[PDB]
Request: fold
Amino acid sequence: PVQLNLLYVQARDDILNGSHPVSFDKACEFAGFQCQIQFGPHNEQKHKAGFLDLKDFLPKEYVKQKGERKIFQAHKNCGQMSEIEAKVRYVKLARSLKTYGVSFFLVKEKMKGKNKLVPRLLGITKECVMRVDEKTKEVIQEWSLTNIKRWAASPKSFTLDFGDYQDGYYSVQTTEGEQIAQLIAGYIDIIL
Amino acid sequence: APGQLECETAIAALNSCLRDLDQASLAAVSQQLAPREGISQEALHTQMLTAVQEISHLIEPLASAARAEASQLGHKVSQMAQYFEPLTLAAVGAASKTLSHPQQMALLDQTKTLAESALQLLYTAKEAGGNPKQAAHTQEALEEAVQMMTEAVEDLTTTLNEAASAAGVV
Reply:
């Protein structure tokens, strides 16, 4: 229909502006479908070397990463696919990722057994809380909301208590603990 | 189940010390850690220094027992665990009597780190059991756990001195 363009624009914009954080590889695959959309079917003679301005095709954190090559592989791989469906495979691919429609906060964790803070993406959905790598965007751990028993925000931190689901609270340094808590408190009220 | 029950209990007790440390931090981070009365800063720091030194002296012997002697491992882990209850109590009291909030948090955090490293030592030591036929993956993990505890002891110790100096504790 026409919805598919509105949806495409929205999924696409979220990845470009960083609201939907994705791995480099996926960024590129997305860029591949965006090329198919904006440029039609790939052509090795036109779609060349400095043909793309990467700042309109990748999230800011990946522009200086030298991605043209693999954006072009993902573009080639589309072939004579049409805008309409290229747009749909993008929206499908986005939907396919565990990061899709998660609210994310950049926090800091203390490494277990070490006096060292690491940056970390903490994500909150409907269903779960998840720890995600700042660089790779790997989902390194998830907890169901149903396993969260208590929580507390301060102006400097946020802390979860999973009760007898695991040993140890999970706790992060953040200036956004209140928002994080309101998100989670909302979702858990809703599950009733 | 030779030395293995001692590991389980030891591990459970460290898990418990760590929850007390997270409560103190939570309370602390929101400026509601009431200073503990009935006891001097001197005696708390003395409690903390002692327990740390004894934990430190126990790391290699524990590690070595895990590479060979199942019976001995069971005794060394329970030894190592006994020290953590008093350390945790002392650390929460000391922190509560510390005036500078950053220094109060550093005591708690570094004590947490040490308990965490102890926990990992215990996991890898329990996996090793007495049995020397453990894999080199168990060997490398244990040596790492040991190295991690040693650095934790180093860090907390320094932080102990600094806090001591701020509080005139001698």
